[PDB]
């Protein structure tokens, strides 16, 4: 009777926004504690019940107008294409939706600051699979690559998303058919046995439980948005301390994350303790990625003296390697879907006497 009966167990203490389907984020106090988010804490966004996949009979279908159909086993995907490792942060379009909900009610799961997580993904390059199928580096005209999941709507339509053909074929874009996550088998909640990972691009495009790759001209495989969000803008949030905390006087360590879409590196994080009147530069920690390939977040921290009996409004904002900035307030960027919530994050705390 329960369509979600076969869903996997999860780590206790996740912040669960929806049980069926399962949508949850790590608690903020753990989010910035490790550069790579442990698989058990990695935020989970499921539209549907989690597919149960027998690994030996699993086949990935690859097709398209000038290709020729492949039916690839998991063994074949592991052995016939060189394995690549890409460290990439996935962020939901609705990350920080609850801050937008606070201004005016929205539609969608009220994610806090934790609909974002980072892993080292291992797999075959989509580029290598598509070239093997007979697709060329370049096609005359505008084309896309569509991905279908094994999870399907009751009406029949599988979860699907697409990316431009140029991104799918680019050596530098690092698009993976990932079968490995942080050194181990892809967990069920994260797309076992195979997912697409599209670095620098909204999480929605990294299709889990992959069943079909299809090449198609721009104008069947359907992207669920039926323009559509691809790259995301600059994002940052304070994960320590937490809203409403009472902190002891003396030194305070403020920590958080920052990230930008499209492989743009975070080059600076500014932190304020007085609601954005004065700023100090945070120390950044990251993987120092190649130019235009900064797929992973920067974790940041700043240790600052705080005075007994005062009130703090901690604010952070980031700048990327193309010198993009964040908007300063939520109200002007508000939208009914509560997506693209990237205004300066503000956290109010009191300093104890």
Ligand X SMILES: Nc1nc2c(c(=O)[nH]1)N[C@H]1C(S)=C(S)[C@@H](COP(=O)(O)O)O[C@H]1N2
Site residues for ligand X per CB under 6 A: 42-48, 90, 92, 149, 151, 159, 190, 203-204, 206-209
Residue of 45, 97, 188, 345 that binds a second copy (CB under 8 A): 97
Options 93, 258, 282, 340; binder of ligand MOM; rule CB under 6 A: 93
DSSP letter assigned to residue 96: T
Q: Is 332 in the site for a second copy (CB under 8 A)?
A: no
* Residue 20 or 283 with smaller CB distance to ligand MOM: 20
207 binds, among a second copy, ligand MOM, ligand X, none (CB under 5 to 8 A by kind): ligand X
> Does the protein bind ligand MOM through residue 100 (CB under 6 A)?
no
Nearest in space to 106 (alpha carbons), one of 341, 338, 340 = 338
188 near ligand MOM, judged by CB under 6 A: no
CB 160 within 8 A of CB 222: yes
Question: What distance in Å separates the CA atoms of residue 299 and residue 282, rounded to the nearest whole number?
Answer: 10
- Is residue 203 part of the contact set for ligand MOM (CB under 6 A)? yes
What does the DSSP assignment read for 268-317? EEEEESBTTSS-EEPEEE---PPTT---S-EEEEEEEEE-TT-EEEEEEE
Are 332 and 291 in contact by the 8 Å Cβ rule? The answer is: no
- Nearest alpha carbon to residue 134 among 164, 169, 160, 100: 169
Token readout for 167 is: 């991104």
With CB under 5 to 8 Å by kind, the binding choice for 106 among ligand MOM, a second copy, ligand X, none is: a second copy
Burial class for 79, CB neighbours closer than 10 Å (0-12, 13-18, 19+): exposed
x/- map, 106-145, a second copy, by CB under 8 A: xxxxx-----------------------------------
10 Å CB burial of residue 92 (0-12, 13-18, 19+) is buried
17 lies in the site for a second copy, by CB under 8 A? yes
Q: To which residue do tokens 């697709």 refer?
A: 135
Task: Out of 202, 213, 282, 306, point to the residue binding ligand MOM (CB under 6 A).
Answer: 202
On whether the CB atoms of residues 43 and 26 are closer than 8 A, the answer is yes
Q: The tokens 């939901």 sit on which residue?
A: 92
One of 9, 12, 154, 305 touching a second copy (CB under 8 A): 154
**Contacting residue, 45, 125, 167, 212, with ligand MOM by CB under 6 A:** 45
Q: Which does 305 bind (CB under 5 to 8 A by kind): ligand X, ligand MOM, a second copy, none?
A: none
Minimum gap (Å) between residue 269 Cβ and a second copy: 28
Binding site for a second copy (CB under 8 A): 1-3, 17-20, 97, 101, 104-110, 152-158, 220, 222, 224, 226, 336, 338
């Amino acid at each position: 009777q329960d369509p979600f009966a076969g869903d996997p167990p999860r780590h206790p203490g996740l912040r669960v926004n929806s049980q069926k389907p399962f949508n949850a984020e790590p608690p903020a106090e753990l989010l910035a504690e490790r550069f790579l988010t442990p698989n058990e804490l990695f935020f989970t966004r499921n539209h549907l019940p989690v597919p149960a996949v027998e690994p030996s009979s699993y086949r990935l279908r690859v097709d398209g107008p000038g290709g020729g159909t492949l039916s690839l086993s998991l063994a074949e995907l592991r052995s016939r294409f060189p394995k690549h490792e890409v460290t990439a942060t996935l962020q939901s379009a609705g990350n920080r939706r609850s801050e937008m909900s606070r201004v005016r009610p929205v539609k969608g799961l009220p994610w806090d600051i934790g609909a974002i997580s980072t892993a080292r993904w291992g797999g075959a390059r989509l580029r290598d699979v598509l070239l093997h199928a007979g697709f060329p580096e370049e096609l005359q005209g505008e084309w896309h690559v569509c991905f279908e999941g094994l999870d399907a709507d009751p009406g029949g339509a599988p979860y699907g998303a697409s990316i431009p053909y140029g991104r799918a074929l680019s050596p530098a874009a690092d698009v993976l058919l990932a079968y490995e996550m942080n050194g181990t088998e892809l967990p069920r909640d994260h797309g076992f046995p195979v997912r697409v990972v599209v670095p620098g691009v909204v999480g929605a495009r990294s299709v889990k439980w992959l069943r079909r790759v299809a090449v198609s001209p721009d104008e069947p495989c359907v992207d669920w948005d039926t323009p559509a969000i691809q790259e995301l803008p600059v994002q940052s949030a304070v994960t320590q301390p937490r809203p409403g905390a009472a902190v002891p006087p003396g030194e305070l360590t403020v920590k958080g994350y920052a990230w930008s879409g499209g492989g743009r590196e975070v080059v600076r994080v500014d932190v304020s303790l007085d609601g954005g009147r004065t700023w100090k530069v945070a120390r950044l920690m990251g993987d120092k990625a190649p130019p235009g390939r900064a797929w992973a977040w920067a974790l940041w921290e700043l240790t600052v003296p705080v005075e007994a009996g005062t009130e703090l409004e901690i604010v952070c904002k980031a700048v990327d390697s193309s010198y993009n900035v964040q908007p300063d307030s939520v109200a002007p960027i508000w939208n009914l879907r509560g997506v693209l919530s990237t205004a300066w994050h503000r956290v109010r705390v009191s300093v104890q006497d």
